Amino acid sequence: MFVKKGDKVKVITGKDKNKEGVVLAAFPKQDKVIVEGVNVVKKHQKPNQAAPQGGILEVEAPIHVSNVMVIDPSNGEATKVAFKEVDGKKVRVSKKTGEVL
Amino acid sequence: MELLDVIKRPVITEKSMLAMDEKKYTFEVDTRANKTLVKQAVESAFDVKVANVNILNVRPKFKRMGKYAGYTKKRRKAIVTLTEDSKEIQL
Amino acid sequence: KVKEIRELTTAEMLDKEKQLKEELFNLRFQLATGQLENTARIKEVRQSIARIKTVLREQ
RNA sequence: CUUCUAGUGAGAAAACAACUGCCCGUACCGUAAACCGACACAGGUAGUCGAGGAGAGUAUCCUAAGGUGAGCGAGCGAACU
RNA sequence: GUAUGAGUAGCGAAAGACAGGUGAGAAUCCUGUCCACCGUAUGACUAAGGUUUCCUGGGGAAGGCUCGUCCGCCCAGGGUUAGUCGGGACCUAAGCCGAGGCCGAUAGGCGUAGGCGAUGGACAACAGGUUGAUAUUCCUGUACCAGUUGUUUUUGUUUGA
RNA sequence: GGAGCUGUAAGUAAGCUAUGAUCCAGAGAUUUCCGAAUGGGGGAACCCAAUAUCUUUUAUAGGAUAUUACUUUUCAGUGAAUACAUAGCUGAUUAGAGGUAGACGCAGAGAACUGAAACAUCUUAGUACCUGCAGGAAGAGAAAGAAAAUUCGAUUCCCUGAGUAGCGGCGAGCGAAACGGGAAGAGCCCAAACCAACAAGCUUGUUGGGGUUGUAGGACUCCGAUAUGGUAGUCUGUUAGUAUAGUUGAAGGAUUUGGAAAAUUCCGCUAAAGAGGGUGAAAGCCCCGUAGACGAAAUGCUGACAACACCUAGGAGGAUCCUGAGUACGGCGGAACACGAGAAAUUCCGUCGGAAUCCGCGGGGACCAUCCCGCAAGGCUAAAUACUCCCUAGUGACCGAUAGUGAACCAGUACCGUGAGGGAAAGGUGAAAAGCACCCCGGAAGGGGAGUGAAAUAGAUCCUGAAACCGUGUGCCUACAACAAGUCAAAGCUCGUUAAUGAGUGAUGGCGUGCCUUUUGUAGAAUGAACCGGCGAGUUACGAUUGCAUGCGAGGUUAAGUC
Ligand SMILES: [K+]
Ligand SMILES: [K+]
Ligand SMILES: [K+]
Ligand SMILES: [K+]
Ligand SMILES: [K+]
Ligand SMILES: [K+]
Ligand SMILES: [K+]
Ligand SMILES: [K+]
Ligand SMILES: [K+]
Ligand SMILES: [K+]
Ligand SMILES: [K+]
Ligand SMILES: [K+]
Ligand SMILES: [K+]
Ligand SMILES: [K+]
Ligand SMILES: [K+]
Ligand SMILES: [K+]
Ligand SMILES: [K+]
Ligand SMILES: [K+]
Ligand SMILES: [K+]
Ligand SMILES: [K+]
Ligand SMILES: [K+]
Ligand SMILES: [K+]
Ligand SMILES: [K+]
Ligand SMILES: [K+]
Ligand SMILES: [K+]
Ligand SMILES: [K+]
Ligand SMILES: [K+]
Ligand SMILES: [K+]
Ligand SMILES: [K+]
Ligand SMILES: [Mg+2]
Ligand SMILES: [Mg+2]
Ligand SMILES: [Mg+2]
Ligand SMILES: [Mg+2]
Ligand SMILES: [Mg+2]
Ligand SMILES: [Mg+2]
Ligand SMILES: [Mg+2]
Ligand SMILES: [Mg+2]
Ligand SMILES: [Mg+2]
Ligand SMILES: [Mg+2]
Ligand SMILES: [Mg+2]
Ligand SMILES: [Mg+2]
Ligand SMILES: [Mg+2]
Ligand SMILES: [Mg+2]
Ligand SMILES: [Mg+2]
Ligand SMILES: [Mg+2]
Ligand SMILES: [Mg+2]
Ligand SMILES: [Mg+2]
Ligand SMILES: [Mg+2]
Ligand SMILES: [Mg+2]
Ligand SMILES: [Mg+2]
Ligand SMILES: [Mg+2]
Ligand SMILES: [Mg+2]
Ligand SMILES: [Mg+2]
Ligand SMILES: [Mg+2]
Ligand SMILES: [Mg+2]
Ligand SMILES: [Mg+2]
Ligand SMILES: [Mg+2]
Ligand SMILES: [Mg+2]
Ligand SMILES: [Mg+2]
Ligand SMILES: [Mg+2]
Ligand SMILES: [Mg+2]
Ligand SMILES: [Mg+2]
Ligand SMILES: [Mg+2]
Ligand SMILES: [Mg+2]
């Protein structure tokens, strides 16, 4: 996937549009990703998971990868990603600035 | 087959524990292993002396989960009785 | 690992295979009881034996 | 299996002690609710044992050992079958 | 797919009664007592066949012609121990296969040697005990059959057992 | 290739991974048992052996490894009746067995229903089935040919000839070929004469040379050339390309509705990319892609280059020799040729008889003469052609869950049958499980709240949710009535619409025997339908003919095929 675990991304579509967060987990097979504090859901858990209250837990659910854009770390803006080989290493580059990653 | 491959695992059940009290131990063994081979394998593995080995074949047992039904794998059970004046097998 | 195996000699390889077989035997017994914790160790040992046999055959 | 020689032959026999002896089946039903009959079906299913009184008898009636009370019942006590 | 017939036919040979218990719930499950039925069987063993239906602990959706707390049902564990029993490492009958071989548009048909093939022949262990479930299989006691090693004892080593 | 991964498949549990995992492609290792199954046996996936080596035990028992089927080829040794021999036997060696792709090819064997309006000749049909052999294609193929325009020059296949010539109880039907136009193209080897050698018994077999044909060729004898060209050969390399993973690959933000924007609106931008798919609704610019550019360690495939290899002679003479024998051909009996014995050639099978050989032989549809054409009884040969179980990439005025494969789903399954064999049903929550924590009735099931959600009358029997069928509520009517159940007329009561000389119900009165099929005639006591839903019957191809229409018009038009 053009996005990777731990990247800073911007949500471009969905109820959480314009939110930003770090990628907590990636699912290449599903082409989905989890962004902290994004797409939070209330889940009615039984107390069977070492939680002696069950309660209504809050957890981020995955969103489709195409609904996010990687944050240009040097500029802080969302950008599309090109692939340029630098020093013999294939790396991502911000099309808006040319910055790496 | 390799002697180490002859014996698969012990059998722990109420019947097998009662047998242990009499100094006979139950092992699942390769289905192609004859009791003479089982005797040799037990001796090499545990340094004990075997008095007798009683072998029996456990038929595959029918099981089913949800829409699917099949049979557990067939097993071969051998009850090995050690001689007196012999070390016990520790499990 | 494969590098270590290739370094070993033939007799060393055979003895290492015997030790691995005995270790696998003990693992089976421990799993049958509740005495085994690192269950993945069983597959690791099986793969190690397979590697040694493959190297032996490729000598 | 027992004998006979032909062959074969440097070891034999006895007692004693210790020791060795593989694979497959072994559960359960089996004049049946588990088998053959689409059924937990008044049918069919080889062989063995199969007691006592009266009795020729395994007939017959009532019983022993043993097994069972039958997988819809409660009333009413009409026609009709 | 759903009606009508219709809440109708039927609920598949026969005796059950009550007390107590269990349980949300009992004519139907458990226990007890009496009563009743089969008894050349409806008892006890076995072969085939079935293939886990066996035992233990749970369950009451569906199956059980009612009910169900229960089941040959569902769920989870567990249960079949052999030198001597039956079969194989023994023998053959009918029949079958069949090296070569004979015959034949093809395919193949037939058949010798040789084999296979029990329902038959041959063949060494019984009594008691034990488990919830196995027992001539496990255990106790006392045996037998085939063979190996070894000690001892006799006797034969090539006119040689 | 570069960050997660340990399938479906959640859940734990334990782990792996930048020392590069998972994953993708090439190559290789392992690959139990059954199965042709092949050490022997056997009721497939099991049992029991022999030999040799090794292994466990003090030792027997036990374990591992290798070999051990049958037939064929070649070789060697042994070796009967029997003397030599041969046969048998043993060993070694050799290559076969079996399965397919329900397709395509060739061959052996070979139906019936059906058609003929019956039926036997005939037709179905050399079809279906069975069996053998195959190859990627097969078969055919290098003229004893087609012809008679005078010529053509192997074979195959397409168009055309043509529904013609013909065959046919001259019925029903069956039905060519040549010429012409195309696809593709390629020609070559032996036998024999004769020569050299070898061996035995002047010939006679082996070997090598020789030679290959119809305007006759060849031997043989003379001459002259030792070249010139070609190939349908090779796990021979070298090289290129290609197949099997991949890398790169442009351009959008806002505003309105919304749970969510890709939709709306406003300004932009990209395009060798506006194919397509996905993304919370419909995206050229968010993602995967596409246009385009680039890429292979390894292994195949193709093509070139080279190498090696194999073929490749001209002229003149005929004195003599050779040029395919139990053959061609004939009688008898069948069969194939469109041709059914017919006037019947030509081809083939069985049986019997049985030639010539260059002044020779065969054919030109009985047969003969003349003329023309060819040279059998030996072999091989690519391309055009047929088919698709499979693999890769796509396409569709093809299906869209009773359709489309029987099978969108764990289907040749469940189930049925002794067996061959027959053979189903069954797709959809939501964008995301966020799959209803907690509380309440209840033993549970199931509900009511409370929550999630845009929506729960989307709650897992989950999208939509028709009709039959079942039930609750009620506005009108109904217990003196004989009813194909309606329609026409109508009081009363109730209600107020697509606002229309409205709607529901309806006392009462008039008239009035369903629908369909099949019949001279059916309410019919003739047939069919239990009801509801879905599915369910004049189509297509090739020809004939007519009408209409268009183009051209004494002309009209191309077919195959090439791009
Ligand atoms: K038993
Ligand atoms: K008596
Ligand atoms: K009696
Ligand atoms: K009952
Ligand atoms: K009554
Ligand atoms: K009566
Ligand atoms: K009904
Ligand atoms: K009814
Ligand atoms: K119970
Ligand atoms: K036995
Ligand atoms: K017997
Ligand atoms: K076989
Ligand atoms: K095919
Ligand atoms: K016929
Ligand atoms: K007819
Ligand atoms: K050919
Ligand atoms: K025609
Ligand atoms: K006719
Ligand atoms: K030549
Ligand atoms: K998107
Ligand atoms: K799109
Ligand atoms: K290559
Ligand atoms: K003819
Ligand atoms: K001719
Ligand atoms: K000719
Ligand atoms: K809905
Ligand atoms: K109503
Ligand atoms: K009326
Ligand atoms: K009638
Ligand atoms: Mg046994
Ligand atoms: Mg028993
Ligand atoms: Mg019965
Ligand atoms: Mg009685
Ligand atoms: Mg009635
Ligand atoms: Mg009854
Ligand atoms: Mg009687
Ligand atoms: Mg029971
Ligand atoms: Mg129970
Ligand atoms: Mg019930
Ligand atoms: Mg016996
Ligand atoms: Mg035979
Ligand atoms: Mg034969
Ligand atoms: Mg006996
Ligand atoms: Mg018992
Ligand atoms: Mg790698
Ligand atoms: Mg075999
Ligand atoms: Mg006819
Ligand atoms: Mg081939
Ligand atoms: Mg792009
Ligand atoms: Mg726009
Ligand atoms: Mg003919
Ligand atoms: Mg003839
Ligand atoms: Mg002729
Ligand atoms: Mg000529
Ligand atoms: Mg060809
Ligand atoms: Mg279907
Ligand atoms: Mg539908
Ligand atoms: Mg179907
Ligand atoms: Mg709705
Ligand atoms: Mg619905
Ligand atoms: Mg009146
Ligand atoms: Mg009235
Ligand atoms: Mg009539
Ligand atoms: Mg009817």
Side-chain angles (χ1 to χ4, degrees):
Chain A
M1 301 199 304
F2 78 96
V3 76
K4 189 188 310 195
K5 180 182 182 62
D7 303 333
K8 187 75 167 299
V9 298
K10 175 185 173 183
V11 177
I12 57 175
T13 67
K15 191 68 178 57
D16 292 338
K17 185 181 174 178
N18 304 329
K19 281 196 183 175
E20 296 179 357
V22 173
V23 167
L24 300 184
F27 309 99
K29 299 173 182 180
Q30 311 157 224
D31 289 345
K32 282 179 178 177
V33 73
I34 293 169
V35 178
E36 55 83 6
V38 173
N39 178 238
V40 181
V41 309
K42 288 163 281 189
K43 182 151 48 175
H44 300 85
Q45 285 293 348
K46 288 288 188 180
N48 57 331
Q49 291 298 356
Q53 201 160 354
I56 301 179
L57 179 64
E58 295 288 25
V59 296
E60 307 89 337
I63 59 173
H64 197 258
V65 80
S66 79
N67 296 343
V68 298
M69 188 177 295
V70 308
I71 288 300
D72 179 303
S74 299
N75 187 15
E77 299 179 5
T79 182
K80 277 162 284 186
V81 166
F83 282 96
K84 314 298 180 178
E85 182 169 6
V86 171
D87 305 6
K89 175 60 171 54
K90 176 180 166 179
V91 301
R92 293 178 295 168
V93 173
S94 159
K95 294 183 180 180
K96 276 188 178 177
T97 78
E99 167 63 312
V100 294
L101 290 306
Chain B
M1 68 194 76
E2 305 288 38
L3 283 183
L4 293 167
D5 295 326
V6 169
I7 298 176
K8 284 184 179 172
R9 58 191 59 79
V11 184
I12 302 86
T13 57
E14 303 83 343
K15 199 177 179 183
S16 58
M17 297 301 292
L18 289 179
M20 286 182 221
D21 282 4
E22 310 309 330
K23 192 188 286 189
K24 48 185 77 195
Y25 304 84
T26 312
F27 301 106
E28 284 180 13
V29 303
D30 178 83
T31 64
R32 307 162 298 173
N34 72 342
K35 57 173 62 179
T36 299
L37 177 63
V38 179
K39 175 179 180 176
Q40 294 180 3
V42 171
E43 274 195 355
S44 79
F46 297 106
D47 195 4
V48 300
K49 304 305 301 304
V50 168
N52 185 345
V53 182
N54 296 302
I55 208 149
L56 69 106
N57 280 314
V58 190
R59 59 178 296 273
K61 201 173 176 190
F62 178 97
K63 266 207 177 195
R64 64 199 314 171
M65 302 220 314
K67 58 198 288 296
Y68 305 112
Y71 292 79
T72 64
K73 63 191 177 185
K74 59 185 290 193
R75 292 180 299 165
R76 192 159 171 83
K77 189 203 302 184
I79 299 80
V80 181
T81 304
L82 307 180
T83 68
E84 287 206 349
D85 289 345
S86 177
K87 298 151 49 52
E88 289 75 343
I89 293 171
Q90 292 150 8
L91 309 175
Chain C
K1 204 153 69 173
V2 67
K3 282 195 172 299
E4 297 183 316
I5 299 164
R6 296 220 172 86
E7 294 164 7
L8 292 174
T9 71
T10 300
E12 297 164 26
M13 268 192 288
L14 299 167
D15 309 319
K16 193 66 175 65
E17 186 177 19
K18 293 179 179 179
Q19 292 174 0
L20 288 176
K21 283 214 140 292
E22 296 191 7
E23 184 177 1
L24 183 60
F25 167 92
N26 308 117
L27 289 173
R28 290 207 304 266
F29 270 55
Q30 296 172 224
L31 180 69
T33 62
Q35 302 172 344
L36 180 59
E37 297 171 344
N38 180 9
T39 63
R41 179 56 185 174
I42 296 169
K43 190 171 183 173
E44 294 166 356
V45 176
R46 282 173 57 263
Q47 307 224 5
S48 305
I49 297 171
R51 268 183 272 274
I52 291 170
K53 295 182 93 72
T54 291
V55 169
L56 280 170
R57 177 64 180 86
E58 93 183 13
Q59 306 312 53

